[PDB]
Amino acid sequence: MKELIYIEEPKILFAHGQKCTDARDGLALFGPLNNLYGIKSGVIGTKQGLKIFRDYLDHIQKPIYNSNSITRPMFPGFEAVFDCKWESTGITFKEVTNEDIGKFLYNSSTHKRTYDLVSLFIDKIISANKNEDENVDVWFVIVPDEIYKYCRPNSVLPKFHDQFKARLLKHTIPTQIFRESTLAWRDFKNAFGLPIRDFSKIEGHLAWTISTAAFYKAGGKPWKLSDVRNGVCYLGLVYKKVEKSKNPRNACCAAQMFLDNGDGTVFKGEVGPWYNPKNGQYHLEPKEAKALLSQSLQSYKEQIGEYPKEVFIHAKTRFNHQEWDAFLEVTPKETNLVGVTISKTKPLKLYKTEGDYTILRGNAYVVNERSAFLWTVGYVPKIQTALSMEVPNPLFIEINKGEADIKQVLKDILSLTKLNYNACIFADGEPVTLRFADKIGEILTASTDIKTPPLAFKYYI
């Protein structure tokens, strides 16, 4: 017989300097943080793709009615809640002919087909930003629906995503990716009860995953955390195998959240080391460890200026002193360095007395000053359902090195979880530095060459 504890849920900063809990409700009532008005987005596709995009734009201008607003809030129009205006016309786009986009589509190899798909996408994007300034700063690119059947299912006949997102970093040109099948929920159907997908039951959510996610790459910040202390860096890292050739090289990367002068957290992602020798260690040598922390230090200097106080380096694998010995000298004396490892190899499940309603999200089981158990997956009254389809499995957060505070690091994880821009869900199953860990790892392994500067997270995913 033991005891557990609960931690108060953090808040997210919204428009007019106010904080709220719900994401869709918060945006639908106040709006994004900034105020941008002039957007003329573009689309890469064909005549049928153009018609699909125009029809979906008209639909999203129209009100979107869901099944139940209690479990998931609806979409109260786009302009009325975002304060950014498009029209049916007045979109600056450069589409492609049907034959050009369909010269070779039955190719089974993803590498060769994407080497031309990405080239076609970018060549029609980087060629329009030179005519007029800040005219095409946003794109809604839609890949053909045949990609949905010949890329992900690996060329089957039932009747990948970062590759045209990574090599565009050289031009510093963002884009937003969609699909006709994602938009044409009424098309390609039959006289069946549930043709293909038929998400008539869920329609407002599909209108929320398309607006807020595309808004962030318009130079505007939708929302940030309102309770982040000044002077903290995170600097996540990802280790996995690269799929170019043998000798995986154990590629690494970085992703750090930090505050600026005032009350605004920077949502930025940096690329550091290239690689390290041999195959299985999930660790880096001291010689390349100098640059990994030095780049973060210098970036913090030139866009903040003052010394930090606590940097909570996050990781998925176990740490070691082989890198800590190099890292301790790089950091200044006034700054404390703490290494934190979070894994998913602890299959713990809690059950209550009775009921189909499951555990909450936020309670913690403290053990000692080395690790803890935190349930980031469960039930919340706002969604009136369980975030998972089965019994939730909590995380395992441990402080490999440093002192910090368990009750304080747990609050950081909960706050850092609710920083999802690609979706507008109330919460996700992993912290953003780990939720997008795979995304960043795969976007980096697509373009290993060319050292990118300390550029913002706007341009990833």
């Binding site: 709220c20 109260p76 786009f78 949905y148 992900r152 009921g355 309603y357 389809m389």
Partner: protein
């Protein structure tokens, strides 16, 4: 004064955005009163509407849709508004919010005189702007535009009456408590006695080899059948150290370490665990590294136990309930228990292809909930329980560690209430997301990350 702008339409039928309109306009600095917003009952809604109209109101809003036609409420409220504007001499009183898509106009009324033809079918921003200069035309005494009171209202109507509340709940975990523990651990000196060139997994009693010291609780003479030459052994060579000092982190030297003695006992408990299951004669299935333990066809009454079904049937496939166990001694000397589901073609033979296996796993799991896991686990534990107090583990000739069958029970200080959405929650989430690269595409890959 007259600054209470009013609205009344088909609220119980279609109210997908009435709350949004109200909150937006109050954030813009206005004042309303509705039927479904505040805590009120729809038994005197029209009487309350008439009472507030005759007391204090300035403008009116109506939303036109397909559901606001077949009811007498809309027409009676329209007639009331007509009478009120006739008495007050108002040529601009009500504003129709034409939101219907399939229907343009159905019933012609004299109410068109005091309103204007506005189309809200396409967009809402244009209509909101238009109603703003509608306010600005007559110089309405608009209040301050602040979202603080808008938020304060947001935690007063939309949900937030069912949020987390202080309530104690008892949570039973997967760990297994142990009450009886061995007094001392036997560190025998074998060296040449046991030659290293033999596997240890086939040994009847638990044993872990460490250089020359065999970390085991069994007697030195217990290992007679597997090794006949164990009779020649001096008792003093069996070095005994109490396990409580190791647990307390007090016994540490060059011979053994506190941080190193803990991990050797873990393998012993796991080995005793598969010994305990093979005592029960169940079927074995190695999935990746950790084995789930399940009971096969024709071994239990009605293919079930207590009051729940374990060996069930789904279409032409036989689904079973599997349990995988482990041991962890770091927080407490306790046992890890996990659950799994495996599928059999005929109840005896297993499919060598795991693709359809995890497909059926997800298919069966998307229709289960907390009870269909917790009750099944509890029944399985009770079936594995030997006595009525706590099942035991076999280690040797006299050693008997008793493990509490009752799971470790906690006390959650925070909980929530389920007034009437106990059944509504399961029906809404039956159809999950099964798309490709747009929402989730490495679901199978994440499931089978156990590639080594």
């Amino acid at each position: 004064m007259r600054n209470k702008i009013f609205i009344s339409h088909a609220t119980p039928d279609d109210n997908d955005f009435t709350r949004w309109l109200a909150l937006k306009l109050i954030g813009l600095g206005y004042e309303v009163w509705c039927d479904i917003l505040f805590l009120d009952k729809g038994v005197d809604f029209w009487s309350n509407i008439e009472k507030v109209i005759r007391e204090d109101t300035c403008k009116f809003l109506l939303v036109s849709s397909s559901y606001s036609n077949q009811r007498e409420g809309v027409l009676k409220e329209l007639a009331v508004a007509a009478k009120v504007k006739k008495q007050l001499k108002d040529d601009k009183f009500i504003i129709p919010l034409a939101i219907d898509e399939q229907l343009s106009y159905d019933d012609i009324n004299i109410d068109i005189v005091r309103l204007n033809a506005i189309d809200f079918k396409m967009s809402w921003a244009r209509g909101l702007k238009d109603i703003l200069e509608a306010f600005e035309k007559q110089k309405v005494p608009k209040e301050v535009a602040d979202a603080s009171k808008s938020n304060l209202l947001y935690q007063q109507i939309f949900l937030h009456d069912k949020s987390v509340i202080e309530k104690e709940e008892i949570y039973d975990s997967n760990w297994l408590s142990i009450l009886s523990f061995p007094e001392e651990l036997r560190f025998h000196e074998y060296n040449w006695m046991l030659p290293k060139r033999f596997d240890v997994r086939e040994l009847t009693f638990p044993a872990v080899r460490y250089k020359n010291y065999l970390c085991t609780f069994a007697w030195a003479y217990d290992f007679t059948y597997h090794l006949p030459k164990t009779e020649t052994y001096h008792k003093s060579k069996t070095i005994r150290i109490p396990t409580e000092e190791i647990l307390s982190g007090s016994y540490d030297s060059n011979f053994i370490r506190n941080a190193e003695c803990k991990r050797l006992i873990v393998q012993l408990l796991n080995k005793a665990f598969e010994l305990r299951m093979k005592d029960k004669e169940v079927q074995e299935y190695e999935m990746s590294n950790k084995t789930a333990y399940w009971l096969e066809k024709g071994k239990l009454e009605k293919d079930k136990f207590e009051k729940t079904m374990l060996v069930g049937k789904q279409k032409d496939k036989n689904w079973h309930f599997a349990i995988s166990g482990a041991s962890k001694l770091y927080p407490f000397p306790v046992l890890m228990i996990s659950s799994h589901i495996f599928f059999t073609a005929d109840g005896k033979k297993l499919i060598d292809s795991s693709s359809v296996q995890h497909s059926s796993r997800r298919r069966q799991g998307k229709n289960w909930w907390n009870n269909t896991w917790r009750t099944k686990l509890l029944a399985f534990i009770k079936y594995l329980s030997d006595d009525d107090t706590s099942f035991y583990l076999e280690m040797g000739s006299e050693e008997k560690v008793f493990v509490s069958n009752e799971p470790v029970k906690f006390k959650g200080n925070v909980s929530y209430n389920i007034p009437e959405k106990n059944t509504l929650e399961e029906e809404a989430e039956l159809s999950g997301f099964n798309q490709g690269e747009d929402i989730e595409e490495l679901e199978e890959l994440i499931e089978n990350l156990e590639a080594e």
